[PDB]
Design a protein around this nucleic acid. Structure first.
Ligand SMILES: [K+]
Ligand SMILES: [K+]
Ligand SMILES: [K+]
Ligand SMILES: [K+]
Ligand SMILES: [K+]
Ligand SMILES: [K+]
Ligand SMILES: [K+]
Ligand SMILES: [K+]
Ligand SMILES: [K+]
Ligand SMILES: [K+]
Ligand SMILES: [K+]
Ligand SMILES: [K+]
Ligand SMILES: [K+]
Ligand SMILES: [K+]
Ligand SMILES: [K+]
Ligand SMILES: [K+]
Ligand SMILES: [K+]
Ligand SMILES: [K+]
Ligand SMILES: [K+]
Ligand SMILES: [K+]
Ligand SMILES: [K+]
Ligand SMILES: [K+]
Ligand SMILES: [K+]
Ligand SMILES: [K+]
Ligand SMILES: [K+]
Ligand SMILES: [K+]
Ligand SMILES: [K+]
Ligand SMILES: [K+]
Ligand SMILES: [Mg+2]
Ligand SMILES: [Mg+2]
Ligand SMILES: [Mg+2]
Ligand SMILES: [Mg+2]
Ligand SMILES: [Mg+2]
Ligand SMILES: [Mg+2]
Ligand SMILES: [Mg+2]
Ligand SMILES: [Mg+2]
Ligand SMILES: [Mg+2]
Ligand SMILES: [Mg+2]
Ligand SMILES: [Mg+2]
Ligand SMILES: [Mg+2]
Ligand SMILES: [Mg+2]
Ligand SMILES: [Mg+2]
Ligand SMILES: [Mg+2]
Ligand SMILES: [Mg+2]
Ligand SMILES: [Mg+2]
Ligand SMILES: [Mg+2]
Ligand SMILES: [Mg+2]
Ligand SMILES: [Mg+2]
Ligand SMILES: [Mg+2]
Ligand SMILES: [Mg+2]
Ligand SMILES: [Mg+2]
Ligand SMILES: [Mg+2]
Ligand SMILES: [Mg+2]
Ligand SMILES: [Mg+2]
Ligand SMILES: [Mg+2]
Ligand SMILES: [Mg+2]
Ligand SMILES: [Mg+2]
Ligand SMILES: [Mg+2]
Ligand SMILES: [Mg+2]
Ligand SMILES: [Mg+2]
Ligand SMILES: [Mg+2]
Ligand SMILES: [Mg+2]
Ligand SMILES: [Mg+2]
Ligand SMILES: [Mg+2]
Ligand SMILES: [Mg+2]
Ligand SMILES: [Mg+2]
Ligand SMILES: [Mg+2]
Ligand SMILES: [Mg+2]
Ligand SMILES: [Mg+2]
Ligand SMILES: [Mg+2]
Ligand SMILES: [Mg+2]
Ligand SMILES: [Mg+2]
Ligand SMILES: [Mg+2]
Ligand SMILES: [Mg+2]
Ligand SMILES: [Mg+2]
Ligand SMILES: [Mg+2]
Ligand SMILES: [Mg+2]
Ligand SMILES: [Mg+2]
Ligand SMILES: [Mg+2]
Ligand SMILES: [Mg+2]
Ligand SMILES: [Mg+2]
Ligand SMILES: [Mg+2]
Ligand SMILES: [Mg+2]
Ligand SMILES: [Mg+2]
Ligand SMILES: [Mg+2]
Ligand SMILES: [Mg+2]
Ligand SMILES: [Mg+2]
Ligand SMILES: [Mg+2]
Ligand SMILES: [Mg+2]
Ligand SMILES: [Mg+2]
Ligand SMILES: [Mg+2]
Ligand SMILES: [Mg+2]
Ligand SMILES: [Mg+2]
Ligand SMILES: [Mg+2]
Ligand SMILES: [Mg+2]
Ligand SMILES: [Mg+2]
Ligand SMILES: [Mg+2]
Ligand SMILES: [Mg+2]
Ligand SMILES: [Mg+2]
Ligand SMILES: [Mg+2]
Ligand SMILES: [Mg+2]
Ligand SMILES: [Mg+2]
Ligand SMILES: [Mg+2]
Ligand SMILES: [Mg+2]
Ligand SMILES: [Mg+2]
Ligand SMILES: [Mg+2]
Ligand SMILES: [Mg+2]
Ligand SMILES: [Mg+2]
Ligand SMILES: [Mg+2]
Ligand SMILES: [Mg+2]
Ligand SMILES: [Mg+2]
Ligand SMILES: [Mg+2]
Ligand SMILES: [Mg+2]
Ligand SMILES: [Mg+2]
Ligand SMILES: [Mg+2]
Ligand SMILES: [Mg+2]
Ligand SMILES: [Mg+2]
Ligand SMILES: [Mg+2]
Ligand SMILES: [Mg+2]
Ligand SMILES: [Mg+2]
Ligand SMILES: [Mg+2]
Ligand SMILES: [Mg+2]
Ligand SMILES: [Mg+2]
Ligand SMILES: [Mg+2]
Ligand SMILES: [Mg+2]
Ligand SMILES: [Mg+2]
Ligand SMILES: [Mg+2]
Ligand SMILES: [Mg+2]
Ligand SMILES: [Mg+2]
Ligand SMILES: [Mg+2]
Ligand SMILES: [Mg+2]
Ligand SMILES: [Mg+2]
Ligand SMILES: [Mg+2]
Ligand SMILES: [Mg+2]
Ligand SMILES: [Mg+2]
Ligand SMILES: [Mg+2]
Ligand SMILES: [Mg+2]
Ligand SMILES: [Mg+2]
Ligand SMILES: [Mg+2]
Ligand SMILES: [Mg+2]
Length: 116
RNA sequence: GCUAAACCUAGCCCCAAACCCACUCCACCUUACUACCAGACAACCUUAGCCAAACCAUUUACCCAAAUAAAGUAUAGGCGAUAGAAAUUGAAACCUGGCGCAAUAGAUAUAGUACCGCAAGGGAAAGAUGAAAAAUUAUAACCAAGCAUAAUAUAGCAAGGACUAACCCCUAUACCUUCUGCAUAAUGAAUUAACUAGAAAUAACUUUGCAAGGAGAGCCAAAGCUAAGACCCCCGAAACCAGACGAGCUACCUAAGAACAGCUAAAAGAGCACACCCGUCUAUGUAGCAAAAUAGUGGGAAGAUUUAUAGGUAGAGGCGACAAACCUACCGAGCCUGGUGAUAGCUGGUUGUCCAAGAUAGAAUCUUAGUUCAACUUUAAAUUUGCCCACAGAACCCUCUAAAUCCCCUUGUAAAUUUAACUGUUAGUCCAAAGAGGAACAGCUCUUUGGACACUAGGAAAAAACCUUGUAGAGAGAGUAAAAAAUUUAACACCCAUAGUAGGCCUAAAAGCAGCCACCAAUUAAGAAAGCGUUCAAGCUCAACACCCACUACCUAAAAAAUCCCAAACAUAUAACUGAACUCCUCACACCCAAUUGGACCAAUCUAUCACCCUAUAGAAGAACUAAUGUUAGUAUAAGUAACAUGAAAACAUUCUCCUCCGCAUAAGCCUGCGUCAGAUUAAAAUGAACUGACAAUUAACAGCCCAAUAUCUACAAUCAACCAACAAGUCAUUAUUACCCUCACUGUCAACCCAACACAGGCAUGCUCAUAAGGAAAGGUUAAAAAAAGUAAAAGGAACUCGGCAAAUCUUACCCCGCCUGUUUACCAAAAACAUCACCUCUAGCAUCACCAGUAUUAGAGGCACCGCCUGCCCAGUGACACAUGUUUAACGGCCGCGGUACCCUAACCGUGCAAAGGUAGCAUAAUCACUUGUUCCUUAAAUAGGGACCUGUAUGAAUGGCUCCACGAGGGUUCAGCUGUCUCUUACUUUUAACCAGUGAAAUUGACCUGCCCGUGAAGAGGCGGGCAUAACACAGCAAGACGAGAAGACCCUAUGGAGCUUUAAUUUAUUAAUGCAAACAGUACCAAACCUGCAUUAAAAAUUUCGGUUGGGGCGACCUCGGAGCAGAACCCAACCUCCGAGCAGUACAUGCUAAGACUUCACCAGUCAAAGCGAACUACUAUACUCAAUUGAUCCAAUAACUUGACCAACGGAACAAGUUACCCUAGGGAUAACAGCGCAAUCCUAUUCUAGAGUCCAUAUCAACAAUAGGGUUUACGACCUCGAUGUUGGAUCAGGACAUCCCGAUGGUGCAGCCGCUAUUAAAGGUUCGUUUGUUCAACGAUUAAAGUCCUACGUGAUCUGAGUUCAGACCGGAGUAAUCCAGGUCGGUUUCUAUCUACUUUCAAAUUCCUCCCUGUACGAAAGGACAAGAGAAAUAAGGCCUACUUCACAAAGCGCCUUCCCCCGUAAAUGAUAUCAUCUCAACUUAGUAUUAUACCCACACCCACCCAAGAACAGGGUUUGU
RNA sequence: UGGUAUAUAGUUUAAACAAAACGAAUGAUUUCGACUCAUUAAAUUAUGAUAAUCAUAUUUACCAACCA
RNA sequence: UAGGGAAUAGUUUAAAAAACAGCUGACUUUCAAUCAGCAGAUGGAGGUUCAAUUCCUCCUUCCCUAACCA
């Protein structure tokens, strides 16, 4: 009988992006394999780890994935990060979580091919 | 032992072969089956649609002249669904058979007959001996249901375990379907027999053959190829189209006919009133007399009347005084056949045994009742890891610094992935936990984690979701698991008090105690005062001393609903026992999940070959029925029930009694259908006969069946036809000339009769009779209960009944609304205010040989309004029409304002301003007119939501969509005087019918099976069937209607379906058709130019056609929403919903290598799409965090179109998008749904109600006489909501009548406590449910108001108790009006008039709770107690009444061997809330859940009933039957 | 019963610390008056809290309703 | 309860203008009319934009519509 009002909120129907870690600590990866996806920089690229447009971390070499805590030093051109470290107390250091790939195989080997 | 059972032929089916094709005579196209006369009418012309496309709109296979192959190829196509060649290639061919049926099969077939239908057309059923029936006292018996032989004994899904024993004991909630879940009161089923339902490609698998080849040309082939085997149901709509058949009913019309007494007036669409026509109201009837009737009452009855006969109009239609009427007994558009096995995402159904595995995140979708992908699940195969998991490791911003997860060697285990091939599931329930919404309600809704259920067992009482427990068998063995409810409450001090001082101040006063300051001090000891109190004072307590032991607790305070409480019981014998399908023991072992899937066996039948008292191995298939409101047949149940029938006596000769609705004849129709003989047949009836067989019969004068030609003639009604007067202007006639001498044939003739399925209470024209000279019988017999039906009479009253004076009686006044009037309509729920109508007005048309019309603008046609009377106002902006250059037109569609201010208020002549085409004029007005509204006032009634007259901005009155008056009329609606009455107070008596009993005959719906109880509880939420209790030998008959969610009709309300149809339109598409215009074509004439018809191509109208009308949704509608991104819910890998909470997007800017290419990866849970990228080529570069731009989303598939190419194109926003389609249905239809609303129940308790706790405030003071705020704690289930659990193959819904059952939260009556209780009246609380709780006016009302009363006129529940008991005013279909909405169809919370209420009782229950009675008033006490006065009791006692219950007839009254009331008689106990004594714990006191005493209690008292084979028969104050009483009154 | 509005001099009426209006008085003015002008008197439904705002009950207004 | 629209000088309208009203004068014996001058406005709050009656958002007042079916 008595009619009621409607909800005034629209949208909010987006689905999950299925982002996060794809390769955990100790996993074996091949060159090109995506290690992690993210919308903001939660994990930073370390050794033999590339970063794409969308902050996607991928393996540059074949090997084992490792996660570490390292000291963060921004690039001087980056003004937002450089305007933050100049306001820190003398003695403080910023830390961030980096992901690395420890290579497994060597670049190659020298083989005998002829005896001239 | 009956009924029955059983059979093998009749013939039929599919092929082959072969082309096929008459006859005695007579008759047959007119009314077919009819001997015989003047004619000329003639045949051809695209099938459409269902359906498919999941809608639909282009489109959607249908032999078309050779099997195979080419080939499902070329090609076509909303390039979708699907459709689909050819060239070319090139085979075989002996009718006489059957792994076909065998009487529900096979042809429908014993036959296109019987029968149904006007017609087209539809369309059956069944038989059974034997060699011989010229062997008929024959051919044995044994078998379905149903019965009989032979009824029954506490108790219960009917059995099982058993047992000496049938029953008694113990255990046990029918089946199918459908669901989250059914004993469910959800579906289907009476039962027996028979019949009745899974059809196939692709690929793959299995088993042979051959093998780089296979195959009996085609084709395939990187082990393939050939062959075989093995997988895809049944019934059902409303509809659509084509072609036939129908106007003997009905609607209208044509031709020529008929009927209408009597009276009044004599003029009549006049009145009274027969025949006749219609069908107003009431009752009855409701499977009937009747698929629309009967009785009574009513309307009309010389006209727009009624009616017989023949003919005409036919479904894309007709007809229509429009009711969406009627067109052969369901017309929103007929019937039949066919297309047609229409379609159905929907319901129902789906047939042998046994084992095994087996419950599922989600996405898209005109999609959420479905489907596809994924996920889960199954089988086969290959391979190698899967599950469990150690450290280490995974973010800052930030609020819960969460339980956890992700990753993961070891370890313990045995699964996992991949490949191949498939189906089903995709409508979820509770519990725990984390949360969202709602109300920190819901058996509520939405997500997540896990569990259980949808499988077994045990337990929690019964029990889907809680606990225990799972792997299957036998056992008269054992050990265990879970598993039983505990609690009982409030005593408390005694004793004593002098003084500075009335401290100071304030104050009228302030003295311990209104306020401010101080708060010192006397006495052994006592506050410049802690609580009451006083106007201020007085006055009473507390803190003090003394005395000596109060020598305490300071942890909780209640309860009430409705049929009947609910196991029975128990405080004391030593913790162990009982207890499963778990586990052990002896033996055995494939032997307990829906859908789905895999596998092992098999009945019968046919065929091949065996076999040979009924089998084997194989091959085949119409291969298996406890269920489809299934089909046919048989037989039960209801049920020997409902219902049906014959006037009397007698010599069967006749007579008597009573009806007379008639009767006789003709026409029509029918066709031998009560004449004789006979009968085994038949009626209720083993004389009669309408049935069977034979025989006979209706005789023409009545009637029917007619006529030579040509030309020609026919002005003057009828009505007693004469006066007279009319309009509606009428039914009757010849002559001339020619031709023409035979004559009585043929047919109908009966009856008790036709149309309605009937030997039907219906329908049926005319003449005479008009109450009969003709024709008929209401009672089978008895009894004389209820209820019911039809009548008669009724004391006193006289509408108090009721929605209403319905009905009955009686013979009557006045008024209002609507419509003028007679008239017409929804055959079968509406007769009316609706339609028509005289009159008025608008529009169109200047004319002839089939309508209008044999007419000509004083005409005809299309429409509106509705006689008359007074009137019909303003608007042409918009739409339309006309005219076309403006323009014209509303008696065409339609429309006809607002703001602010001013005379005290109200109002505004007036002032200011804007808009419009014009601004609602006259009039009327609380209306039949949205709501407000029961508006105000007068009349009317004792009392008025009624009615009438007025007042009235009515903001939604209003003028030919006609407005306002006024005669007459009305089965219209409303009010009323008077009278009348059984309508009512308040019923009663009698008669008839029915009824019951006897006799005869003998139905229907219904039926899972039944060995068919009550209470409470439980439960799919309302139990005869479950749990706990109570009750209980068996059995008929008559009554009742509370229940069996009783019977009946697959709900008509509501929702759903990409289901239908009707109507409307500014929905989409289209103009075939019709009309007009233009061009062309055709055609001619003297640079100009050609009539029309016809054809083609365009344009514009008209009138139509086809198709559709999205979804989500705490039912639908309205509103809102539909794609993408960020945040929270979701805290830590990923994922996660709500019509949940917030913020955003549908770009922009910079580059111009945002160039080419390419490993490896992520992925919005599928697909599609989307995303990140090393190296490399080529560039750039030595500075630019440059080498995939910044930016969060910043977006759109295929086809198609454009384009030379590159490339571009949709707010396809319903955003995975249909190339293009809206409304309405109450005129509606079909399929379903309790998956989904409205009534009811159930849950919940926000709202509502009640109580308690708290003590601010009110009450002069005074918190608790009384009332009560802010809040708190519980309970109730009467309101309004919310939820969607049972029911939509039906649970009938308001109020009232009838009868009431129950709760107490008590309205009166009773007993008590308190009072701001003097008394009389009251307020409040405790206890009490035995008894009682009125009549009236308006309203449909429940309520409410009012009038008069009462001791009181209680609150609630019982399916808002009760419709198989009633009522239908209201609500709530089909008709209609008003206002409003809309272009219209149509619609509204609106108002108004009208509108069919079925049921024969099978079961349960009940049908004498036998018998104590309640209250008011009067007198008296008493003018007493009380009291200033006014005023005015209780108790005791007495008397008289009312009601109720139970009886009776002396009188009265209705009546009369009797029954009744209006009359008379009788009527008997109590209830418990408290108030008081004695007296301990606690030596006072204290009514004591202390022992005890009293008010103060009934084994409710007693009363009633109490014997028993004379009993055939009769009588009765006894009674339905039976029974009972009497007969010492059995001629 | 329900909610929704409600209140201001003596009345009438904006607004609450109280504004204007009718009437009253007073003068100014006129030969005297009316008009006019000026001046004066005159009020917040009352109860409890915030401290002047919410409540509290009244007060009259205002619409709502058995049901099928 | 749901939904749409509106708010501009004291008043009524327009896309920051007019009209009156008001104030100041002239004309008239006086008033009115007339003539000549002067003033006054974007309900409220918040935000974008250099700039907002003119782009959005919430609140107040008022208006209109719907509030249905059994
Ligand atoms: K369809
Ligand atoms: K047959
Ligand atoms: K059920
Ligand atoms: K049912
Ligand atoms: K059932
Ligand atoms: K069934
Ligand atoms: K005819
Ligand atoms: K069903
Ligand atoms: K569906
Ligand atoms: K004092
Ligand atoms: K006959
Ligand atoms: K009849
Ligand atoms: K006679
Ligand atoms: K009729
Ligand atoms: K009538
Ligand atoms: K016009
Ligand atoms: K009236
Ligand atoms: K009146
Ligand atoms: K009109
Ligand atoms: K009438
Ligand atoms: K009587
Ligand atoms: K009954
Ligand atoms: K029923
Ligand atoms: K709901
Ligand atoms: K869509
Ligand atoms: K609720
Ligand atoms: K139902
Ligand atoms: K005591
Ligand atoms: Mg989100
Ligand atoms: Mg989501
Ligand atoms: Mg289709
Ligand atoms: Mg060919
Ligand atoms: Mg046959
Ligand atoms: Mg038998
Ligand atoms: Mg038993
Ligand atoms: Mg079955
Ligand atoms: Mg259900
Ligand atoms: Mg059950
Ligand atoms: Mg039952
Ligand atoms: Mg059903
Ligand atoms: Mg098959
Ligand atoms: Mg069609
Ligand atoms: Mg047709
Ligand atoms: Mg006829
Ligand atoms: Mg006839
Ligand atoms: Mg005629
Ligand atoms: Mg006459
Ligand atoms: Mg007459
Ligand atoms: Mg008459
Ligand atoms: Mg007619
Ligand atoms: Mg009509
Ligand atoms: Mg109609
Ligand atoms: Mg079908
Ligand atoms: Mg199994
Ligand atoms: Mg779509
Ligand atoms: Mg689904
Ligand atoms: Mg591992
Ligand atoms: Mg799913
Ligand atoms: Mg639930
Ligand atoms: Mg003192
Ligand atoms: Mg003093
Ligand atoms: Mg003092
Ligand atoms: Mg004293
Ligand atoms: Mg005092
Ligand atoms: Mg003091
Ligand atoms: Mg003391
Ligand atoms: Mg045991
Ligand atoms: Mg076991
Ligand atoms: Mg076993
Ligand atoms: Mg066998
Ligand atoms: Mg066999
Ligand atoms: Mg079969
Ligand atoms: Mg059978
Ligand atoms: Mg059957
Ligand atoms: Mg019976
Ligand atoms: Mg009978
Ligand atoms: Mg009879
Ligand atoms: Mg004759
Ligand atoms: Mg005769
Ligand atoms: Mg008789
Ligand atoms: Mg009889
Ligand atoms: Mg009777
Ligand atoms: Mg009488
Ligand atoms: Mg009355
Ligand atoms: Mg009267
Ligand atoms: Mg009455
Ligand atoms: Mg009458
Ligand atoms: Mg009339
Ligand atoms: Mg007249
Ligand atoms: Mg009718
Ligand atoms: Mg009628
Ligand atoms: Mg009329
Ligand atoms: Mg007019
Ligand atoms: Mg005005
Ligand atoms: Mg005024
Ligand atoms: Mg007027
Ligand atoms: Mg009205
Ligand atoms: Mg009356
Ligand atoms: Mg009007
Ligand atoms: Mg009108
Ligand atoms: Mg009348
Ligand atoms: Mg009439
Ligand atoms: Mg009998
Ligand atoms: Mg049944
Ligand atoms: Mg029960
Ligand atoms: Mg009986
Ligand atoms: Mg009965
Ligand atoms: Mg149904
Ligand atoms: Mg459709
Ligand atoms: Mg269709
Ligand atoms: Mg659509
Ligand atoms: Mg919908
Ligand atoms: Mg809804
Ligand atoms: Mg909408
Ligand atoms: Mg994916
Ligand atoms: Mg590179
Ligand atoms: Mg979509
Ligand atoms: Mg998507
Ligand atoms: Mg209607
Ligand atoms: Mg139906
Ligand atoms: Mg339900
Ligand atoms: Mg309900
Ligand atoms: Mg029920
Ligand atoms: Mg409750
Ligand atoms: Mg007080
Ligand atoms: Mg639910
Ligand atoms: Mg049923
Ligand atoms: Mg009580
Ligand atoms: Mg009572
Ligand atoms: Mg009821
Ligand atoms: Mg009943
Ligand atoms: Mg009625
Ligand atoms: Mg009515
Ligand atoms: Mg109307
Ligand atoms: Mg009537
Ligand atoms: Mg009835
Ligand atoms: Mg006395
Ligand atoms: Mg004592
Ligand atoms: Mg003592
Ligand atoms: Mg003077």
């Amino acid at each position: 009988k008595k009619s009621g009002g409607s909800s005034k909120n629209l949208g909010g129907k987006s689905s999950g992006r299925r982002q996060g870690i794809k390769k955990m600590e100790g996993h074996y990866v091949h060159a090109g394999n995506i290690i992690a996806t993210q919308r903001h920089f939660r994990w930073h690229p370390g050794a033999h780890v590339g970063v794409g447009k969308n902050k996607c971390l991928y393996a540059l070499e074949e090997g084992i994935v490792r996660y570490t805590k390292e000291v963060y030093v921004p690039h001087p051109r980056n003004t937002e990060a450089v305007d933050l470290i100049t306001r820190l107390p003398k003695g403080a250091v910023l830390y961030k979580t980096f992901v690395h790939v420890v290579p497994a195989k060597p670049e190659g080997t020298f083989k005998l091919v002829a005896m001239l």
